[PDB]
Design an enzyme around this catalytic site. Sequence first.
Site, PDB file in Angstrom:
ATOM      1  N   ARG A 142       1.638   8.963  11.576  1.00  0.00           N
ATOM      2  CA  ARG A 142       0.241   9.279  11.876  1.00  0.00           C
ATOM      3  C   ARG A 142      -0.791   8.606  10.966  1.00  0.00           C
ATOM      4  O   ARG A 142      -1.369   9.234  10.081  1.00  0.00           O
ATOM      5  CB  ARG A 142       0.045  10.796  11.849  1.00  0.00           C
ATOM      6  CG  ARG A 142      -1.288  11.267  12.387  1.00  0.00           C
ATOM      7  CD  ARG A 142      -1.321  12.778  12.427  1.00  0.00           C
ATOM      8  NE  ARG A 142      -2.474  13.320  11.716  1.00  0.00           N
ATOM      9  CZ  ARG A 142      -3.557  13.818  12.304  1.00  0.00           C
ATOM     10  NH1 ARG A 142      -3.636  13.851  13.631  1.00  0.00           N
ATOM     11  NH2 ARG A 142      -4.561  14.276  11.561  1.00  0.00           N
ATOM     12  N   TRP A 143      -1.018   7.321  11.210  1.00  0.00           N
ATOM     13  CA  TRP A 143      -1.978   6.525  10.454  1.00  0.00           C
ATOM     14  C   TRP A 143      -3.411   6.753  10.934  1.00  0.00           C
ATOM     15  O   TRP A 143      -3.998   5.891  11.597  1.00  0.00           O
ATOM     16  CB  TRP A 143      -1.669   5.045  10.624  1.00  0.00           C
ATOM     17  CG  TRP A 143      -0.491   4.573   9.910  1.00  0.00           C
ATOM     18  CD1 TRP A 143      -0.145   4.867   8.632  1.00  0.00           C
ATOM     19  CD2 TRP A 143       0.479   3.648  10.390  1.00  0.00           C
ATOM     20  NE1 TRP A 143       0.989   4.179   8.274  1.00  0.00           N
ATOM     21  CE2 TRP A 143       1.396   3.423   9.337  1.00  0.00           C
ATOM     22  CE3 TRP A 143       0.666   2.985  11.603  1.00  0.00           C
ATOM     23  CZ2 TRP A 143       2.484   2.567   9.458  1.00  0.00           C
ATOM     24  CZ3 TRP A 143       1.754   2.127  11.727  1.00  0.00           C
ATOM     25  CH2 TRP A 143       2.652   1.927  10.655  1.00  0.00           C
ATOM     26  N   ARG A 181       1.156  12.324   7.481  1.00  0.00           N
ATOM     27  CA  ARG A 181       2.124  13.352   7.850  1.00  0.00           C
ATOM     28  C   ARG A 181       3.071  12.794   8.901  1.00  0.00           C
ATOM     29  O   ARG A 181       2.665  12.007   9.758  1.00  0.00           O
ATOM     30  CB  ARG A 181       1.424  14.593   8.376  1.00  0.00           C
ATOM     31  CG  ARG A 181       0.786  14.433   9.720  1.00  0.00           C
ATOM     32  CD  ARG A 181      -0.168  15.582   9.967  1.00  0.00           C
ATOM     33  NE  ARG A 181      -0.585  15.639  11.364  1.00  0.00           N
ATOM     34  CZ  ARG A 181      -1.628  16.331  11.799  1.00  0.00           C
ATOM     35  NH1 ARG A 181      -2.362  17.025  10.937  1.00  0.00           N
ATOM     36  NH2 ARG A 181      -1.927  16.327  13.090  1.00  0.00           N
ATOM     37  N   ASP A 197      -4.349  21.663  10.397  1.00  0.00           N
ATOM     38  CA  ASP A 197      -4.602  20.938   9.141  1.00  0.00           C
ATOM     39  C   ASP A 197      -5.632  21.628   8.271  1.00  0.00           C
ATOM     40  O   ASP A 197      -5.950  22.793   8.514  1.00  0.00           O
ATOM     41  CB  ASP A 197      -5.026  19.489   9.389  1.00  0.00           C
ATOM     42  CG  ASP A 197      -6.189  19.385  10.319  1.00  0.00           C
ATOM     43  OD1 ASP A 197      -6.562  18.243  10.678  1.00  0.00           O
ATOM     44  OD2 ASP A 197      -6.721  20.456  10.695  1.00  0.00           O
ATOM     45  N   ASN A 208       0.790  -1.231   0.000  1.00  0.00           N
ATOM     46  CA  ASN A 208       0.000   0.000   0.000  1.00  0.00           C
ATOM     47  C   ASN A 208       0.826   1.288   0.000  1.00  0.00           C
ATOM     48  O   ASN A 208       1.938   1.348   0.529  1.00  0.00           O
ATOM     49  CB  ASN A 208      -0.962   0.004   1.207  1.00  0.00           C
ATOM     50  CG  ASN A 208      -1.744   1.321   1.354  1.00  0.00           C
ATOM     51  OD1 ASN A 208      -2.570   1.676   0.502  1.00  0.00           O
ATOM     52  ND2 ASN A 208      -1.487   2.044   2.446  1.00  0.00           N
TER      53      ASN A 208
END
Lengths: 152, 474, 455
Positions: B175-176, B163, B273, B158
Amino acid sequence: YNDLRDFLTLLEQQGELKRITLPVDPHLEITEIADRTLRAGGPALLFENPKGYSMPVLCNLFGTPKRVAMGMGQEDVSALREVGKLLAFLKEPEPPKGFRDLMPTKRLRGAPCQQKIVSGDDVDLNRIPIMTCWPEDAAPLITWGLTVTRGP
Amino acid sequence: YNDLRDFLTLLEQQGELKRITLPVDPHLEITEIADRTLRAGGPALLFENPKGYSMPVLCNLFGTPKRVAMGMGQEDVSALREVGKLLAFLKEPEPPKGFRDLMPTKRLRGAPCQQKIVSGDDVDLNRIPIMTCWPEDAAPLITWGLTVTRGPHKERQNLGIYRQQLIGKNKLIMRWLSHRGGALDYQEWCAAHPGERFPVSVALGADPATILGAVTPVPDTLSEYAFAGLLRGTKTEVVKCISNDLEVPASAEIVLEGYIEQGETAPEGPYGDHTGYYNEVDSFPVFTVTHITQREDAIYHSTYTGRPPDEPAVLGVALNEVFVPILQKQFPEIVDFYLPPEGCSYRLAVVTIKKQYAGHAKRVMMGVWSFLRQFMYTKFVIVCDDDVNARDWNDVIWAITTRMDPARDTVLVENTPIDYLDFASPVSGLGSKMGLDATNKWPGETQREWGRPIKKDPDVVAHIDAIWDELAIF
Amino acid sequence: NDLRDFLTLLEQQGELKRITLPVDPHLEITEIADRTLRAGGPALLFENPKGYSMPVLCNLFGTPKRVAMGMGQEDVSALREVGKLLAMPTKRLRGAPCQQKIVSGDDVDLNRIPIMTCWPEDAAPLITWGLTVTRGPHKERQNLGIYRQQLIGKNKLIMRWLSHRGGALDYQEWCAAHPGERFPVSVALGADPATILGAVTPVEYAFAGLLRGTKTEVVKCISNDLEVPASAEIVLEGYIEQGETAPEGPYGDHTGYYNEVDSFPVFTVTHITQREDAIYHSTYTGRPPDEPAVLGVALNEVFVPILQKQFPEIVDFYLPPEGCSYRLAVVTIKKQYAGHAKRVMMGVWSFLRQFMYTKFVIVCDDDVNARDWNDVIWAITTRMDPARDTVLVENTPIDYLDFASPVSGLGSKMGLDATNKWPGETQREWGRPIKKDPDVVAHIDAIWDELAIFN
């Protein structure tokens, strides 16, 4: 398999078809018998002695999920899923022109459905054992039969 | 076309690229320049004089729908539709066994992304001009670069955009957010091989296709790299990593190899964000970089997120152009489907259909909140007719205000799933959605004589359309 | 000074473009003016009108900056002081320039004037502007008011008197006092900006005066006692024969829909006093925004100060043109406690009468630009939860002509609380907005030019 006749011989072998040689009226009587029949599993019914008609009346053909499945060359209610998978796949057959660089109808000349013919002057629909379903229904009503039309 | 370098030479020729040889600081200064730039069209920016670094910082690459389109071998925002048609078709490639009786990854041996290499003892991430975006941000944060991971049993790999916070000379934070992609391969590896370190690789500055491929959502019936091939035209050239079997694009500018030490986590300091607000501190896995491989004279690709218009915001506008056809194939009544950036790229959608029966608006409504997964969190949907420009607030507001009765024509549904970070909701991960159809009401929907709308004359709009440039008004 | 003078300055600022190409006043001007307005665009002077002699002035108020210069105030938000003012005659010149040319009898001919058609389904050409003057049979105080007049004859216009008060009231009483006698009427086309503007504000000729300081100049009409502005480009002196009423075919209006047929008084033109090298001034009213909508936006500024006296927290009150310049409102305020937004909401729907018909109200915080949809949508989408932040009040009074309500004159209103929710309203950690430090902003500010990004 090829035509209705073959489907009925198949069903009759598998005990899925019953022939009511007894005199039955296509005027709301066939419905009653079919209703009870369908309300309890019951095979497809083929009345070959409709009161006042020479054509045997065939009904409750797809009165069971089993028989519906069979009618689709699957003989298994579960198999219907495979027909869903097919339907999905048929929707998107080919890709757009951008990234593209990477079952006809057999018409016959003669047909058994044209063995007997009558037209215009004498096309009495009253000869066909069209059935009436409920007591307050307006008049006999053709219920099956696929209507074929073509756009302009 | 083949790699980033070629994409930049192309853009620079087309005036879509600008080189800031002047001294600029990657600490929130690049963002400022990029922000203004993006807020006014502006070309991709290439700072070759970052204060205190030898790597030129490349940003605002997809700062325009035009450039996003180009990056997909289309050179036309409209062409994106063809990419939607393709995506749809890729979903159902082959039929079931019942009625069945009737683009590989070119791996190279060598790769420019492995021209320069450093590992373990000396893998200083401080050498890379990782930029800080906003004044209250925790620390430098890698923003681009596709994270590559592989499941504990699935051969396929994948590509993910996560970020990454700089917490050490060789430690980043992974940061999943999602419960899929790399996050899934990790919680899965932990099962299959508990305790053993999970392999991970990040590729910075890959070909626009591999990048955009990682962005656009593709059916599990095709590998991320594969899709990039169709877009690019040719198979994507990947290359084996050094400390693992993962495959990263050979033309990548910089590649980070390493692992994730089971259990090792770290608080992802505040960050602003797409919403335009700062994210609150949260714990996440920590990526250990054991290897840094790059090209000769490699440039650092980076971006940022903040109040939209955003670098990603525009990418999303360009990406929504591909969903339109996928959406239309399902609801032929849909003329145009648009999601304004101001609405944080996905929080609001405007749909314009050809109403063919009373109550129709509600169907497209449910349709939007259920069909595709990228529109399950949008909490605002406006349905309009084909005589309004979904992309022009003047048209939409006119519709809302002239052909709508608030109480009567608004649909509120509660306790629907919503973004865990949408603080405006009553409870995290749970909120309400509002649908407001502003379609002309038909008999039944109303008992009043509806207004006859003003429709411009096609020939006139066509005449002044030609004489327009001759009329030097601007 | 006058119209001709206002155009000079306007052009001196690059806000007036003359169009030499031949354009047809028959809906072609509209299509052009309509694009021009929607995208900034200066005032337009169509010098070469197809099938006509005199040029056409259009869209001079298509921008709030032009409406501002239309009074030397240069400040769009200067009308606020005028509103606070709500707590000086004319100068009747003898022989005005608007009388350098005069015609009468069967020499009228309105077909000679480039009166435009706005939409493809419009009944006939229509005169959007024009200062209609009428003197009641009692007081010696005349009325103004703007009324659209449909062309229906070489010297006949349909006088569509909207409400039953004002210009229309005169004709009524007049028929009473003087039954069977022709009612004098005149229409000025081209009055100075100060005059025309003041004409479209609720308080008549005095207001226009204060807008420019010095009183306005008028001039006796050649066929009646009415006093039209001396600066006018052309005057239509005629009368409205008692009982004579013609059907006004369907016309598209500011709402962007065609108005059904209806009968109105017919203005019979007996004289056309104009001036040498006179220009024709008109506008267009179609799907918003349009010249009139963006003009009411500025006029609506006189209410802001009246709303602030009662609701000090209101930072900005706005009614964007797209909402018909009255149906949707956006209010930004300095919230001070939980539920504050609701108080303002109902304050909008009840305080002033001219606002009690606003169907949609959106309350936001002062860090939002009510006039910027990029800020409003942001607020709406980032600080709201459809469920609890929407107020839906039913069975309320609304525009009798708003066919969207379930019943004529009655319908519902919606309030949107897109303000930052406080401890009582939300029970979770609200977000802290991303604010940029000035030191870095200042820095690239001084470097921006050097960075030839767009140069």
